[PDB]
């Protein structure tokens, strides 16, 4: 399997009482940061508060993205988690404010359940009937239709509306075709021809399908997780309609448009109504904005306003610079590149740099997860190299060492392999020196 930068991170590694073990879940060190992340994860799982914001502040290569992905893993696949980077907000189709609003709503999941009844099987009979009296109806005066379906557990004779007969005619269903009728909406689908009649003709283009399993009429309760933005898109760009105008619109590209506040208000009303009935439940997720330094002043101000909404995920921010002028502004030097008013709404989680032992343990774990064996002396050399230039350099240099060792048909990486890798690939400081 592919080995990403944060593959070794398997979890936050916390105890039941909240204490974090020294080495668990792929983490090494960062005790206080891990405890703060555990408190935040508890807050997210509580699912009560809206618009809370925290900021993961620290230098480059400290673990901000590592903590974000660890939080995502710990939350589970039932909690929304929208990763992002600051640069993606600058759209060319709609204002950056609209894109921030869209992404911000994506992290409010809704779990809605619906029970559906479907009639499926193989058609055995189809005997349309007219009204008992010619004066009963208009024109064709077609009454109910009788259809016979066959399943693995038996057969059933159904009495259908003339609208369902019209659907049957539209779908071009003949005797022996496997069909599928939804009593919820009256929609008829033509699955295909039964495998029983597969060899009826020795050359024919027909999608033969097996006989449906189970009963002919099976009732199932369907549960799906849908975002609020999904409902907004469905209202904005519905897929319904079979007119020529509908088809022409379908061929058009799905350009983003500034969905009005009225549509969100109506969506909120209907979702509140359905949650009130108990059918559906709201799940506020988490929105992750990496490289918050790159946001414009307008985006920061809209973030200020978004946090005052009634429905709002917990935005987690990452910044790797201090005392830096805010983009889009000439004079405002700010603590982390974040405007002072937004900083006043944030909670800073300080992350601290590592020592040699932590680097050594991280290199051990990274080599282990890489399916590479490293000698103790070569590992000490790699640790010294990382503490000399950067940890990330060594963490990436593990792979070329492994490749070089394989080219020599050696099971483990030797110090000479590390030296040769050093010769082949330089670092930023060495490149700057050699360019001088």
Partner 1 sequence: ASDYKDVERTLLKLFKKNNQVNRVDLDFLNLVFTLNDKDLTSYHAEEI
Partner 2 sequence: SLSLIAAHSHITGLGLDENLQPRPTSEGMVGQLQARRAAGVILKMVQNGTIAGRAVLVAGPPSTGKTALAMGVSQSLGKDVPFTAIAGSEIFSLELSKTEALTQAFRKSIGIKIKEETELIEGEVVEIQIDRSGHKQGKLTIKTTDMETIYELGNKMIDGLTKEKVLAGDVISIDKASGKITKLGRSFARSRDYDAMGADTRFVQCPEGELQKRKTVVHTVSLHEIDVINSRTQGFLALFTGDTGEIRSEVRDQINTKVAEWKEEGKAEIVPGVLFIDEVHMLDIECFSFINRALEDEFAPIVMMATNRGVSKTRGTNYKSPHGLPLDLLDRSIIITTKSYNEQEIKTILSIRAQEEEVELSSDALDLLTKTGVETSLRYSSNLISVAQQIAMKRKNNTVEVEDVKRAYLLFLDSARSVKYVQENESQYIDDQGNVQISIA
Ligand X SMILES: Nc1ncnc2c1ncn2[C@@H]1O[C@H](COP(=O)(O)OP(=O)(O)O)[C@@H](O)[C@H]1O
Asked if 230 is part of the footprint of partner 2 (rule: CB under 8 A), the reply reads yes
Among 163, 373, 377, 416, binds partner 2 (CB under 8 A): 163
Residues counted in the chain: 436
Q: Which is nearer to ligand X, 38 or 121 (CB)?
A: 38
Can you say how many angstroms the Cα of residue 48 is from the centroid of all Cα atoms in its chain? 22
Asked if 408 is part of the footprint of partner 1 (rule: CB under 8 A), the reply reads no
Asked if 252 is part of the footprint of a copy of itself (rule: CB under 8 A), the reply reads yes
Q: Which is nearer to partner 2, 358 or 378 (CB)?
A: 358
Q: What CA–CA distance (Å, rounded) separates 395 from 153? A: 60
Closest CA to 379 of 363, 365, 392: 363
Among 13, 40, 65, 69, binds Mg ion (CB under 5 A): 65
Asked if 204 is part of the footprint of partner 1 (rule: CB under 8 A), the reply reads no
Q: What CA–CA distance (Å, rounded) separates 110 from 283? A: 6
Asked if 227 is part of the footprint of Mg ion (rule: CB under 5 A), the reply reads no
Among 42, 93, 114, 200, binds partner 1 (CB under 8 A): 114
If binding means CB under 8 A, how many residues of this protein chain bind a copy of itself?
Answer: 3
Return the one option of partner 1, Mg ion, ligand X, none that residue 389 interacts with (CB less than 5 to 8 A, by type). none
Find tokens 């921010």 and name the residue.
317
Q: What angle do CA 360, 363, 368 make, to 5 degrees?
A: 130
Closest CA to 33 of 74, 10, 62: 62
Return the one option of Mg ion, ligand X, partner 1, none that residue 119 interacts with (CB less than 5 to 8 A, by type). none
Q: Which pair of tokens denotes residue 302? A: 């809209």
Q: What angle do CA 77, 78, 82 make, to 5 degrees?
A: 70
Among 92, 203, 251, 435, binds a copy of itself (CB under 8 A): 251
Q: Which is nearer to Mg ion, 64 or 422 (CB)?
A: 64
Phi/psi of residue 382, nearest 5 degrees = -65, -40
Binding mask 232-261 for partner 2 (x = CB under 8 A): -x-xxx---------x--xx-xxxxxxxx-
Q: What CA–CA distance (Å, rounded) separates 213 from 208? A: 15
Interface with ligand X (CB under 6 A): 5-6, 26-30, 58, 60-66, 320, 362, 392, 395
The distance of closest approach from Cβ of residue 252 to a copy of itself in the complex, given in angstroms and rounded to an integer, is 7
Asked if 66 is part of the footprint of partner 1 (rule: CB under 8 A), the reply reads no
Asked if 234 is part of the footprint of partner 1 (rule: CB under 8 A), the reply reads yes
SS3 of 57, please?
strand
Q: What CA–CA distance (Å, rounded) separates 29 from 23? A: 7
Binding mask 169-198 for partner 1 (x = CB under 8 A): ---------------xx-------------
95 burial via Cβ count (<10 Å: 0-12, 13-18, 19+): middle
Query: In this structure, are residues 169 and 185 in contact, taking their beta carbons and an 8 Å threshold?
Result: no
The distance of closest approach from Cβ of residue 112 to partner 1 in the complex, given in angstroms and rounded to an integer, is 6
Q: Which pair of tokens denotes residue 174? A: 């003949």
Q: Which is nearer to ligand X, 343 or 415 (CB)?
A: 343
Longest Cα–Cα distance in the chain: 102
Q: Which pair of tokens denotes residue 424? A: 């082949």
Binding footprint of partner 1 on the chain (CB under 8 A): 112-114, 116, 184-185, 222-224, 226, 230-231, 234-236, 238, 240-241, 266, 270, 274
Q: Which residues bind a copy of itself (CB under 8 A)?
A: 248, 251-252
């Amino acid at each position: 399997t592919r080995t990403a930068a944060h593959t070794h991170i398997k979890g936050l590694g916390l105890d039941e009482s909240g204490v974090a073990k020294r080495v668990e879940g792929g983490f090494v060190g960062q005790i206080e940061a891990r405890e703060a992340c555990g408190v935040i994860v508890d807050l997210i799982k509580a699912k009560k508060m809206s618009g809370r914001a925290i900021l993961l502040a620290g230098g480059p290569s400290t673990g901000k993205t590592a903590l974000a992905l660890a939080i995502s893993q710990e939350l589970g696949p039932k909690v929304p988690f929208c990763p992002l980077v600051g640069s993606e907000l600058y759209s060319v189709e709609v204002k950056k404010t609209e894109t921030l609003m869209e992404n911000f709503r994506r992290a409010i999941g809704l779990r809605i359940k619906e029970t559906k009844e479907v009639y499926e099987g193989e058609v055995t009979e189809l005997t349309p009937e007219d009204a008992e009296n010619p004066l009963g109806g208009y024109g064709k005066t077609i009454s109910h239709v009788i259809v016979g379906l066959k399943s693995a557990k038996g057969t059933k004779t159904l009495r259908l509306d003339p609208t369902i007969y019209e659907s049957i005619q539209r779908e071009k269903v003949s005797i022996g075709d496997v069909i599928y009728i939804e009593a919820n909406t009256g929609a008829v689908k033509r699955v295909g021809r039964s495998d029983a009649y597969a060899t009826e003709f020795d050359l024919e283009t027909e999608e033969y399908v097996p006989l449906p399993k189970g009963e002919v009429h099976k009732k199932k309760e369907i549960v799906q997780d849908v975002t609020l933005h999904d409902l907004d898109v469905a209202n904005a760009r519905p897929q319904g309609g079979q007119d020529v105008i509908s088809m022409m619109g379908q061929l058009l590209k799905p350009k983003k448009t500034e969905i009005t506040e009225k549509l969100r208000q109506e969506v909120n009303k209907v979702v509140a109504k359905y949650i009130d009935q108990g059918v559906a439940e709201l799940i506020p997720g988490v929105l992750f904005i990496d490289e918050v330094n790159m946001l414009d002043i307008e985006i920061f101000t809209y973030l200020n306003k978004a946090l005052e909404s009634n429905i709002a995920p917990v935005v987690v921010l990452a910044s790797n610079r201090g005392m830096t002028t805010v983009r889009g502004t000439e004079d405002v030097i700010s603590p982390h590149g974040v405007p002072p008013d937004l900083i006043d709404r944030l909670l800073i989680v300080r992350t601290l740099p590592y020592d040699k032992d932590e680097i050594r343990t991280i290199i051990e774990r990274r080599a282990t997860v890489e399916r590479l064996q490293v000698e103790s002396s070569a590992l000490d050399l790699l640790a010294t190299m990382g503490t000399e230039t950067s940890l990330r350099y060594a963490l990436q240099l593990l792979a070329p060492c492994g490749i070089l060792a394989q080219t020599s048909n050696r099971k483990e990486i030797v110090v000479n392999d590390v030296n040769e890798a050093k010769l082949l690939f330089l670092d930023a400081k060495r490149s700057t020196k050699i360019l001088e």
